[PDB]
């Protein structure tokens, strides 16, 4: 017989994202900040390294869509879903795409797309929900309003299980 | 924290399924049937469970078509392809489309759906295909007037346990 194998993690530390294209709502360089804070937000408690490719194919592809966008897995318009990523794997694994229904800021005018990129790029690497309601990988977004970010020991914990410690 | 499951499975043994829409080919109640037995050769040897909804969202929906019908596996009108399922997963996850090009059978005669019925939810459970040219998740159709061939025992117990032994 045969399963269908989940890739628990990436087989390689080094990474790459391509941000394919931008949300109407930030400045280029806004949205390119809060993706690289979000990556740094993982590589910063494990060995992984991300860099980021212009062109072409790259591990983690970046997207910014709305309703049916090309997954069969669509968005709804404002509100409810606000984006989603794919586990680690090949093809569509490890890619992120965002609802440009939803409003997306570098503060707090909105959704911090900082604060969500860094919560789907869990999923991109191997994390699942936690039930830990202060973790990152809980389920509901937050903003604090300070203007630097911890990343909570619960996700320390599970990053560190799938990739080690830096 | 928690980390994505090593194998595609369902997180929970209580599952749902609705019927979409029916075929042409067979009464509504002879489809009924069909389903009902596919969905008992799974529970009858592991712990899951499957409950029918009549409408809403269910865990695993069925339906029939015909070309293209939704996602990127069209069907190719009489004979070839004849169904597909998707792993388990949100949306179209666990999901099984039956090509509606094809005659559907309660018999020996044209496609027994029973038989493609119980392989396809195979799929939906997180088996793939097996290279046990007797299995059911072997991937070329036959048919018999059933019990559960050993391979399938052992995949789909190796996914969810065996449920009551005895
Ligand atoms: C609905 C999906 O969940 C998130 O998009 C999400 C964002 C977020 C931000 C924090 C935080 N500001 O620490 C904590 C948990 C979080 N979850
Ligand atoms: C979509 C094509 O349907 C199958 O792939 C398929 C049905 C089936 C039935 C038996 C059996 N007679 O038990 C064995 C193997 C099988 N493979
Ligand atoms: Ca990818
Ligand atoms: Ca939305
Ligand atoms: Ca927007
Ligand atoms: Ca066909
Ligand atoms: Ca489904
Ligand atoms: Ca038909
Ligand atoms: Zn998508
Ligand atoms: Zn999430
Ligand atoms: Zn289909
Ligand atoms: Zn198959």
Redesign the interface.
Known sequence: ??????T?KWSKMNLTYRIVNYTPDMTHSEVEKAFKKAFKVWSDVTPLNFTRLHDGIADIMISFGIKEHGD??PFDGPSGLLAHAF??GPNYGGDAHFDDDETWTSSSKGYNLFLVAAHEFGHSL???????PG?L?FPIYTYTGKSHFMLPD??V??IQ??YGPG
Do not use: E, T
């Open positions: 017989y045969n399963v269908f194998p989940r628990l069969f897995y586990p680690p191997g994390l699942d929900h936690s039930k830990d973790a990988m619960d996700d914990q599970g299980s799938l």
